[PDB]
Design a protein around this ligand. Structure first.
Ligand SMILES: [Zn+2]
Ligand SMILES: [Zn+2]
Ligand SMILES: [Zn+2]
Ligand SMILES: [Zn+2]
Lengths: 97, 50, 158, 50, 50, 49
């Protein structure tokens, strides 16, 4: 059922990057292993996931526009997804300006 | 035959290929045999020696 | 396909404004983008206007707030204004200088217009295999949230 | 099938008793029966003297 | 089967009485009956003199 | 359906009264064409709603 209904995604697993400043606790902004995010990612894994309610969530602010959109995902069996794990959907292209 | 099914196509759902005319010819030759047995007749010309 | 076409009247110290909203379902295989604009030429909406008329507005013409498609009623303190005494060009209203110290009141019609405010379902998907040589990915209809073009008003595309 | 606010329901002519082309085959069998009655009137009954 | 509001549902041609291929077998039996009638007209009735 | 289910009403159409003060923008409270409302009304129309 999940393999029929889900879209193909690339899953890559989060971990904290060891570039965090030993005093301030913040990421190094020049780190190549993580591009200023505190979180590094393991090599991608192919999986299928079913996704719903794919909202864009436009915001218009004094700083400029931002997207805060949200979606609901149902995983495959026997998986332990972890916080800030990242998905990309290579089939689906979004317009931006 | 296809004229009597105007607006239909017979098509393999796994490949989209239409059914080959060889099957139509095979079925026609057997349908002629059936017609030649439902009625006690010889339809297609042939030389008979009795 | 469009639903829930609300006017959304607001009454403010600055004046009235429309903030109405609607829900739109697109055709297949389209990627609508933020602040894309729609007009519905079949559908005409009623609006009202009033202007004080002065020598400048006589010489230069009143720039109308709405994109007037047509006038349904026009009047002044002296009564109805006849069609030989007014003209609209380029969404400017020109009046006979007879009315150099009058106020004119109008009822108008204009085409319905929307801008894409947010996208409630920006992706829906299907792999289709039945009767295909190989699986084909298809993008199903998007759901749009549409907001009415009251604040900044632009001409129709033609 | 119901997915993300799109819903489809289909009832087919297939059923646990009848195949999808049952109706057409039944009508064709009626036509065949009429044709065969006519043709078995055109050709006669077989007979032999013992 | 339903998971997280995605719903998938099947009624199949199987049933407590009829098997999945019931209709096709019934049609094949009709065709067999016609063919056998024709062929049992081609070959004769068996007879013997006591 | 609407003619069966609706009640008979008199509909009259709004427009801004031309009595508005050309400076302050507010209605004249003594205006006979509109009784202190800023909105004048066209002659009534019979409809069902
Ligand atoms: Zn790092
Ligand atoms: Zn004879
Ligand atoms: Zn014998
Ligand atoms: Zn008044």
């Amino acid at each position: 059922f999940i393999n029929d209904r889900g879209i193909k995604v690339l899953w890559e697993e989060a971990y904290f990057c060891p570039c965090l400043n030993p005093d301030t606790g913040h990421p190094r902004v020049d780190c190549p292993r993580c591009h200023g995010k505190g979180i590094a990612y393991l090599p991608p894994k192919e999986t299928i996931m079913a996704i719903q309610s794919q909202e864009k969530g436009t915001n218009q602010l004094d700083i400029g526009i931002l997207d805060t959109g949200t979606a609901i995902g149902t995983t495959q069996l026997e998986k332990r997804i972890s916080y800030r794990d990242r998905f990309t959907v290579p089939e689906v292209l979004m317009p931006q300006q | 035959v296809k004229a009597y099914m105007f607006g239909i196509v017979v098509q393999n759902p796994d490949t989209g290929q239409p059914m080959g005319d060889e099957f139509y010819n095979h079925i026609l030759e057997r349908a002629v045999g059936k017609a030649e047995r439902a009625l006690d007749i010889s339809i297609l010309p042939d030389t008979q020696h009795e | 396909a469009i639903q829930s076409q609300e006017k959304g009247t607001n009454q403010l110290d600055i004046g009235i404004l429309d903030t109405g909203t609607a829900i739109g379902t697109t055709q297949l295989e389209k990627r609508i983008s933020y602040r894309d604009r729609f007009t519905v030429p079949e559908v005409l909406m009623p609006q009202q206007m009033i202007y004080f008329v002065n020598k400048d507005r006589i010489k230069k013409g009143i720039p109308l707030y709405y994109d007037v498609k047509e006038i349904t009623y026009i009047a002044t303190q002296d009564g109805t204004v006849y069609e030989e005494d007014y003209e609209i060009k380029n969404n400017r209203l020109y009046l006979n200088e007879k009315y150099e110290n009058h106020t004119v009141t109008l009822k108008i019609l204009m085409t319905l217009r929307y801008v894409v405010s947010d996208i409630l379902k920006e992706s829906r998907y299907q792999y289709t295999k039945f009767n295909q040589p190989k699986s084909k990915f298809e993008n199903l209809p998007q759901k749009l949230l549409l907001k009415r073009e009251d604040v900044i008003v632009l001409q129709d595309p033609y | 099938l119901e997915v993300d606010g799109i819903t489809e329901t289909i009832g087919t002519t297939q059923s646990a008793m009848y195949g999808g082309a049952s109706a057409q085959i039944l009508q064709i069998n009626e036509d065949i029966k009429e044709l065969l009655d006519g043709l078995r009137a055109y050709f006669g009954y077989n007979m032999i003297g013992l």
